Design a protein around this ligand. Structure first.
Ligand SMILES: [Zn+2]
Ligand SMILES: [Zn+2]
Lengths: 49, 59, 116, 50, 121, 161, 170
């Protein structure tokens, strides 16, 4: 019931993190992480998160 | 194409000219209205929504 | 820019580009016909290797009536000034490297579209 | 090797919205086997386990 | 695996990669506009290089910059290698490395219409 | 002083270089001899190529075009002032003769192209908790999926269960 | 997979396709013809002598030279055939049974273009004007896919499938 709170917190942070990656790519600020297109760097960031 | 879709669906609910088994598909991006009445199309029942409320009232 | 197809006036066929030897001018003759019409473009064939396309030319205004398409109230129109707008990605093949969004004003008789 | 594909037109399911890259919308199961799976993520779970 | 000093610095390895990778004209090119520019110094698209330099049909070819640099190429080697492709069939009147556009201009000298098309492919 | 030349092509090249140096009257304010300077630039081009072929004519035309560039009057001023000696100007590349703005733009594009082509460093949590069995250094990166560990110094990889 | 409605004629799997590479040519794999034919020659046999008149069926907007310069390569690639009759010869010269006399060939190539290809649109005496529209639609849609203006179709997608139940099976 503490672990539940930690998980939920982590998850929300995660969901939160991905929204900014979506904002950056949606406003063209996600610069292509060398060796990648735009659409790849995005997917990488997301999957990392 | 905004007058057709609203008209075709009203008939497809009111059981008269267009039978319940017909599907009418409106493609927005490309200017296409596709209707199928043919056989073998897999489909399933859904509740209708209007405004953001169901047609399935307590009556 | 471009070049278009310019059609014959006699046969209604496709005109080829043809250089006038001994006035030093650019013509448009036919195959089927004996129709000579005088060029203006001074340009024959063009090719965009970059294939630079503006998407706002392909966007139709009819998108706004899409139930399945997210709606904002944070970007207002510029011609009329409406508050509602739908937004979607390029929705195109051949998208080079872009996740850029595109907006359309959600107010009838306007259909103004823009990119931020 | 990728996330859940756009099987419908620019979306994963009809429940979602066109151009939806979020975690829930592309296969990220956020529940546990103890809590149970949302209907959508049930499906996605099946897609993967296939 | 790189040999010497190239092995360390990312800068000096970068040019080795350029020197291995298959770079065609297609990678660098932007826009191909064949034009019936009846005198080279008429410059039917507005250019100066011909006026200073001086067949009735032309291939304006406008190049790329951020592609041209990233491989470290000058029009000097591009025009010479196009010349090595086609021998005495063609010429090129390339731009300068000061200008904003990266224009090329091709003319024949020694079924004519499609030929410019034929060689541009 | 540049040697006198009897070659009609070389004489025309000297005249055209002197005319390019006169572009914008900067030679009057500097009090440089534009005829002598045009002769020295031509002589240095001729000493390199030793023939009047299309290579020589292309080289002279390139220098005339750069001296006449309205976007780079500073190049012509620097040549007239002797900041760029005639022999150096006769060897300089089209990149080295460019405007300072165009040089900085090319340098930025080259730096961005290099940055874009740099492979992303593989992510993970850097830690000194792990000692590498091969090199005995503590510079390691871990990831948990089982803990996978990579040594950043020798590339050695191992796992803990 | 054009089909009429449970006809004694089966389905005709038409293909209309774009070659790899002048460059950029487009061909109809018409049914029972030995091999595929360039699409412009189809519309010529349909009865469209004019150039202007064929493209109005395949290109809806004459104002974008984008799609104009795309069909040129095929439009150039049919300048020898201008009338209906020589056009018929061209398809009729490639039937499974090519007719020994010329009129036999024309009699063939007139029949395949009225009963064989695109049945669902009509099999009548004069339906060319509506067969023209649907073929231009298939070319139009290929031009859209090739321009990248429209996403490729997924063969696995269950909306693109039907089920032979105990009715159709029987
Ligand atoms: Zn004509
Ligand atoms: Zn508006």
């Amino acid at each position: 019931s503490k672990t539940y709170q930690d998980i939920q917190n982590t998850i929300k942070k995660a969901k939160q993190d991905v929204i900014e990656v979506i904002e950056k790519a949606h406003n063209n600020e996600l610069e292509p992480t060398p060796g990648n297109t735009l659409r790849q760097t995005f997917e990488n960031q997301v999957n990392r998160i | 194409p905004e007058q057709l879709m609203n008209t075709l669906r009203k008939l497809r609910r009111q059981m008269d000219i267009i039978v319940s088994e017909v599907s009418m598909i409106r493609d927005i991006r490309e200017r296409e209205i596709r209707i199928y009445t043919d056989a073998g199309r897999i489909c399933r029942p859904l509740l209708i929504v209007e405004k953001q409320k169901l047609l399935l009232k307590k009556r | 820019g471009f070049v278009g197809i310019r059609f014959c006036q006699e046969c209604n066929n496709m005109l080829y580009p043809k250089e006038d030897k001994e006035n030093r001018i650019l013509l448009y003759a036919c195959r089927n016909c004996d129709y000579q019409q005088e060029a203006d473009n001074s340009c024959i064939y063009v090719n965009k290797i970059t294939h630079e396309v503006d998407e706002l030319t392909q966007i139709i205004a009819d998108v706004s009536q899409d139930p399945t398409l997210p709606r904002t109230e944070d970007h207002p129109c510029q011609k009329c000034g409406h508050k509602e707008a739908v937004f979607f990605q390029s929705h195109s093949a051949r998208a080079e490297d872009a996740m850029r969004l595109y907006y359309v004003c959600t107010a009838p008789h306007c259909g103004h579209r823009w990119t931020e | 090797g990728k996330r859940i594909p756009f099987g419908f037109k620019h979306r994963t399911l009809p429940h979602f919205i066109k151009d939806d890259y979020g975690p829930e919308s592309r296969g990220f199961v956020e529940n546990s086997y103890l809590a149970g799976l949302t209907p959508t993520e049930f499906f996605f779970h099946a897609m993967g386990g296939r | 695996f790189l040999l010497g000093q190239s092995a360390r610095d990312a800068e000096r390895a970068k040019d080795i990669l350029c020197r291995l990778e298959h770079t065609t004209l297609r990678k660098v090119t932007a826009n191909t506009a064949i034009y019936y520019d009846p005198n080279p110094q008429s410059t039917v698209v507005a250019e100066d290089q011909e006026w200073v330099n001086v067949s009735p049909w032309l291939l304006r070819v406008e190049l790329d910059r951020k592609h041209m640099t990233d491989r470290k190429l000058t029009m000097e080697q591009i025009a010479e290698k196009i010349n090595a492709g086609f021998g005495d069939d063609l010429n090129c009147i390339f731009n300068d490395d000061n200008a904003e556009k990266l224009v090329l201009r091709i003319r024949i000298m020694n079924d004519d219409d499609v030929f410019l098309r034929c060689i541009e492919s | 002083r540049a040697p006198s030349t009897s070659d009609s092509v070389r004489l025309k090249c000297r005249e055209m270089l002197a005319a390019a140096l006169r572009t914008g009257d900067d030679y009057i304010a500097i009090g440089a001899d534009e005829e002598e300077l045009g002769s020295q630039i031509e002589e240095a081009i001729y000493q390199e190529i030793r023939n009047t072929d299309m290579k020589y004519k292309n080289r002279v035309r390139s220098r005339i075009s750069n001296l006449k560039d309205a976007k780079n009057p500073n190049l012509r001023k620097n040549v007239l002032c002797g900041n760029i000696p005639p022999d150096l100007f006769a060897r300089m590349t089209a990149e080295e003769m460019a405007s300072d703005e165009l040089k900085e733009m090319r340098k930025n594009l080259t730096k961005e192209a290099i940055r874009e082509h740099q492979m992303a460093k593989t992510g993970g949590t850097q830690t000194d908790l792990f000692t590498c069995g091969k090199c005995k250094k503590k510079n390691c990166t871990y990831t948990q999926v089982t803990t996978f560990v990579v040594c950043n110094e020798c590339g050695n990889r191992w796992k803990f269960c | 997979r054009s089909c009429l409605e449970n006809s004694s004629r089966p389905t005709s799997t038409i293909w209309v396709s774009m070659l790899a590479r002048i460059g950029q040519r487009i061909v109809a794999t018409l049914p029972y013809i030995k091999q595929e034919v360039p699409i412009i020659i189809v519309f010529r046999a349909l009865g469209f002598v004019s150039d202007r008149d064929i493209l109005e069926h395949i290109i809806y907007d004459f104002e974008d030279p984008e799609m104009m310069e795309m069909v040129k390569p095929s439009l150039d690639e049919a300048f020898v055939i201008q009338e209906q009759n020589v056009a018929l010869n061209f398809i009729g010269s490639r039937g499974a049974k090519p007719g020994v006399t010329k009129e036999k060939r024309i009699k063939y190539a007139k029949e395949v273009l009225q009963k064989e290809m695109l049945p669902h649109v009509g099999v009548s005496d004069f339906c060319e004007t509506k067969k023209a529209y649907f073929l231009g639609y298939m070319v139009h849609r290929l031009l859209l896919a090739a321009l990248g203006r429209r996403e490729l179709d997924d063969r696995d997608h269950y909306g693109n499938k039907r089920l032979d139940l105990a009715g159709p099976l029987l």
